[PDB]
Design a protein around this ligand. Structure first.
Ligand SMILES: [Mg+2]
Ligand SMILES: [Mg+2]
Ligand SMILES: [Mg+2]
Ligand SMILES: [Mg+2]
Ligand SMILES: [Mg+2]
Ligand SMILES: [Mg+2]
Ligand SMILES: [Mg+2]
Ligand SMILES: [Mg+2]
Ligand SMILES: [Mg+2]
Ligand SMILES: [Mg+2]
Lengths: 367, 374, 374, 367, 374
């Protein structure tokens, strides 16, 4: 049973920032960290870190406020996923990104109690290393082409080119220059509009580039706009920002609106829901990423554990903010991308050993 | 231009509570108040008050947290609706219920500057008084039928019966008993499932009651569930909780998914978006309410002003929390439901005079590029 | 790691048989049992038992033949769900009902290794006891109404009336008589057509009985037939036999073809897929059962463990063959329906202790890269 | 009336194997042979041979087990197609591939009794020779191009290129190299994904190759995925693996989901159902093949007889495993591909004379 | 090989006529008979007989004209179904009702050559006797109810009530009176609108009679009209006149437009196409009849042979003109309805022996590449 919950926040400056996105650039991020303490004194860590306040319907102050409400009613709840989510949903409607942090912490605590990695609790890892993909922030076409080649040479299996908040002509220039730089290396390519394109411009982006094998990731602002362009674009379409619940995913998958997903653990509400999402995609043969918005070692561990349980043929990559984060929470064991790939942790829980005072005194504590 | 913004919270205990909802009951509510101060010293007031944390994706602590972000980036902005919303959207994605409070305050400030009521700024009132509807919490069928007749007798033109969080047969019993009590009085009837029914049970509710003239208000948990039952229910269907943006409303109206709406000002993001919603419903001949989740005189004034601008034949009623709120913010001018109807305010702005210290010291304030946690 | 796999078959005569189904009656059943032995000597048990050879695309000889293929390729594999299913799918396409038995055994082994009940591995039980439903075989209308009241009186929360293989007017007579016997008791009612009705007759069944609150469970023979009647029937529609994979379930739920499911663990391919199914139904607010075709304590334990993890408002009941099965495999711990409900096991794994020789010598065994026909 | 049923199995090593398919490669196949004996002592032969256990929901041990159940309840049934299927369906739900073998045997027995070829019983042959198509197993792009030209020169009217279980880039390379080798010869081309492609990759396959006139055969894993790509691919789409019943075919044909079919006799449940399938396709002007999964002379004869009754303009070819099978069951008369074409048998029944002991003693016999 | 083809016409006055149809009444009918003679002297007989010139796109003079074209191009062709239809389609587009007669004759010849009944060539009879249905012409409601009971008492398993060419209220009166007379007897009921109803009136017919278990057979004039009413009628809908080819049937079955068919052998183009139709309906679990427009023993034998091959639960009945036909072509073996059922013939071919001069001298004959108008 959960005995105590502590909340903290921590600044994560963007190494070589800003990191530039159609829906809003970021210079520094404020992560929200949860520590759950069981009646036996063992602890589990969780984390949620929105990519600033305009990427999605989520912000650092919102995480903390929601987590205060959740934490205030969670003492005595069983530290297992279904009992946890049952209690959380009785306390607060929605706020998946906040609930995610407590879900992560429960999986950490559960794995530590049973002496198994989180990937075991999620059904069993299929691999001991996972692929990643690199995200090029919005930048000059020439710089994107340069960095694309560089990251291919580092060993990334896939590259995501962020686009938008500028004329579509320049986005098309950027994707052509990137493709010219990396064609024949076999690296996979995603064009991410981050909700930034009118249907007018998304139609043009696809029409002009039949022989560039990108997938279009969330080109347009709404689910309905994805529906508008779907029958008129011969390139694959992925959902990202619109995938705000398992219910909405089921609507998209069942109607074959999309060919795949960028999926964030916090958006969907934690590992409990991410594992259902994984199983949905496996049933439907839909590729997907295993990401979160941002974060340090705790988020990185959560993504890596779930990524390890995905059929490699469907796993498009686990993106991590790690390259943009200066300091590990666990200096020796924190997950890191090496050669464009990530080693799966094999110790109990998330595989982290973080000093209970790593983040200073709690901002809030319940029980 | 906005010179300063102050945020407050205030407790509103429910008069004769609790107020019982299928998605979660409420005993007492924390409202979040905004005061905007113009460079010239004039003030405008706004308010947002979720009905606890489980009724919608909204809570009092979330209102405050979002308003801190918004307030921190608003000094210097023009107190006009479109400039305001452009700025707010650049500072924070979504959180309509928080943005609503600043929108209301801006409309108050703007009306006071020009010397006209908010209803004028919204295009002009079509009436000096508006209809309301009474919402029966979930309660025993027999208690429901009694209270239904009582409220019809008070003069309410419409009754909403809250249902759910119990077997469907009890909901059907309750709607039948209510109908038996009020049939022949001409009172309009809504059956509010509060997102609480499976499609199984929504189908049964309609199927068993062809001769009871309810509309089914948000019977099921999702937009997709509304789509499922729509072709299979011969009773009118209204959207409420799922109407989370103008975009989503346009998707529903354009596809004729629904025959009307329960609409809350906070959910849609303030009066600027409510006025667009009104115009969309007028174009589509779709009836709607003009409500909010909860609140005192500031929210009630906002709802009444927009309600006054709706063609009465399409205005299903402005529901107010006022009967459940113990104290007015403005004892002279605060809106009250009288005989099931509401008199439209005629002063400048929202038509309220509220002491600048009515809610105590601020919790938070922003002036220029600085902010202060008090 | 899996060291050895043994296969057995065992006869289960129907207590007071036959058990009468529209797609084919059953007098006695041959169950197929799997025992997995870990390198450390711990054992896990699984089971699959078709209701004869005509109820589904499944039969006892087919279970054994498929398990021989699967078992022959499984030594050395990790006894974890995802590794197991990846391996099984590489050895044999489809045959979910066979794969289910190995899935169950793996969950038993895994729970025993970690010292926790299967319901914990499935995310955590939400309850210490689960509801059940009673299934009335096809029988005279008058016998049906009598037995319906009898089973309501025992405490069952739900009754399934099997129908078909006779004129539709007799099915309608039977559902009306049953309803007249139990109406007012609050017991839920399902009308199971067992794939046996033409669309002609399904339309009539619903059309004639608007005030009888049944759900129609798999009235017709195909997915396409469900699609045909869906827009024309105002009663809820549930899928059963057509739910042959998670993919197909997603097609049905996503298009709102159905309002719920009868689901069998063997049909969907084991607990790993049942847990996904549960999560899909939770996301879509779709009620479902947690059943299997037939079986003894191993199947019954599997169903009860998954059932314990479902929100009670969406769990239509865990049907067990247990009342029709003469003998327990584990006399101490084998699950029994008591007062129409089932106590959730709390021991490690499935919560069973079954003698390694309970089913006699193996018919087949695999260890490493060798197999043996006994 | 049927007096006795005997079951046998027989090994068929793949000549120059393995034979390589996206859904699973095969090195040797185990066929299941049925002999029905009438009350007058005359016999009919049937056969079913899954292409290993992961191609479809079918396997050699499953055939035998199902056939045991069927055989155990078939004594006394009339040896005519509708009475047979009526009895079989009363004994066992589904298992079309098993039922197929008994159906074939009944057509053989029926033709022998009446002294007419099976093609007469199926409505009358329209031709005395039929076209075939050759199936290139998954192989290197260069090797495929080489073998494609070779098989065109042998006289095949159509070539099927098996693809998948590798990056789509290589599949596209393979089809372009094949097309470069055979363009202008007029040979028809099919690209068979064998369920191996995500919708992402099937969209790309078509988009990149508008001027290569392939049909895409079962590119994706499910019926729903075929539905997803149909409005977004300007190449013709054929169903193969998803055509598991006449009911499902009717859904696909009636909704114009597909432009044609790869159809296997065993999948659809025998010649009785294949002849209905033929008539459906004729009504809808949909081309189709006349195939089975694998097998020796008995299967080959069944395919050839039904193929002979198809309007040549709609008959895409009868594929036979015969080139991969070392030994005929009937050395003198077993059907064989010659010059890419197959001579239609003209004797009674299937046109086979097989020693009653050709396969050794029965594994099982009923009555 | 076909050596010679002879064509005849013969008058069939309606016994106790006229026979009244919404699309046009009939007093007497001209049948068109084909005799095919094989190179070896064996003969096969076929027949086609429209119900006058306004019931369908077909008439006796058109049958003869089309048969002259077909016959002129058929000498030397193999008397097997697929070779025949390939040849016929190369000579003349459409005219199924004419082609049917040659198809029937070929099946007769083929059966006689092999020494087996036509039902064997069609895959094997599943029964030694088949059900029939009686068709009540349009008549006063009271006369309809009387005759309905009379025919139920004779043993008919199903009754078709012809309707239309009068106000819909009279049709509704008639179906209600009929139902009141036969309800409780278990007799199946079809309401045949004969293409005669506007969608307005079809909607009313169904709407007013939810508790009368008719199927609506071809209520409206077009395929599009069936599509219009389908989503708005809770009674089963059957296609008849619109089922003009296998292609069109596949369009209807595949889209679940209908729940069954009235099917005529001549309309679909003969037994080869009827057998395909049967197999399509079996795959889709769609009930159907096995009828033809009119005719004597040759048509009746054809219908009975195909009917014998249909699963009895899907065979709604083989309607025959036989009760309205004064004279048999074969007095010994001609099929007769007895107790509402028909005994399946068991001789070779159609099971008929008809004198080669039964219909007088030929009107037309073809041998080799020559033809003769007599
Ligand atoms: Mg993205
Ligand atoms: Mg005025
Ligand atoms: Mg509401
Ligand atoms: Mg417990
Ligand atoms: Mg209706
Ligand atoms: Mg069932
Ligand atoms: Mg195009
Ligand atoms: Mg293929
Ligand atoms: Mg016979
Ligand atoms: Mg008719």
């Amino acid at each position: 049973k959960i005995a105590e919950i502590q909340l903290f926040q921590h600044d994560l400056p963007v190494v070589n920032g800003p990191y530039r996105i159609a829906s809003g650039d970021v210079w520094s991020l404020t992560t929200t960290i949860v520590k759950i303490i069981a009646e036996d004194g063992t602890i589990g860590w969780g984390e949620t870190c929105p990519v600033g306040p305009t990427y999605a319907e989520a912000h650092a102050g919102g995480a903390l406020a929601a987590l205060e409400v959740l934490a205030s009613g969670l003492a005595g709840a069983e530290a297992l996923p279904l009992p946890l989510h049952t209690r959380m949903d009785s306390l607060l409607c929605g706020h998946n990104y906040a609930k995610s942090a407590l879900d992560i912490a429960v999986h950490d605590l559960w794995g530590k109690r049973l002496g198994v990695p989180v990937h075991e609790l999620l059904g069993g890892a299929l691999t001991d290393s996972v692929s990643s993909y690199y995200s090029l922030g919005v930048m000059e076409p020439d710089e994107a082409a340069r960095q694309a080649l560089e990251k291919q040479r580092e060993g990334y299996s896939r590259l995501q080119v962020k686009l938008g908040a500028r004329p579509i002509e320049i986005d098309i220039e950027a994707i052509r220059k990137v493709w010219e730089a990396v064609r024949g290396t076999g690296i996979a390519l995603a064009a991410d509009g981050n909700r930034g394109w009118t249907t007018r411009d998304a139609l043009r982006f696809s029409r002009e580039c039949p022989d560039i094998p990108f997938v279009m990731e969330q080109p347009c602002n709404s689910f309905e706009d994805l529906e508008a362009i779907r029958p008129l674009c011969h390139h694959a379409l992925y959902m990202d920002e619109d995938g705000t619940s398992l219910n909405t995913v089921i609507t998209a998958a069942a109607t074959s609106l999309v060919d795949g997903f960028g999926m964030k653990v916090s958006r969907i509400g934690g590992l409990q829901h991410m594992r259902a999402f994984r199983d949905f995609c496996a049933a439907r043969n839909l590729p997907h990423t295993c990401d979160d918005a941002w974060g340090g070692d705790i988020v990185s561990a959560a993504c890596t554990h779930i990524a390890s349980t995905v059929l490699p043929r469907l796993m498009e990559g686990a993106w991590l903010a790690q390259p943009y984060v200066a300091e590990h929470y666990d200096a020796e064991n924190g997950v890191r991308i090496e050669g464009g790939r990530i080693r799966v942790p094999q110790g109990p829980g998330l595989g982290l050993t973080i000093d209970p005072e790593r983040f200073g005194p709690p901002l809030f504590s319940a029980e």
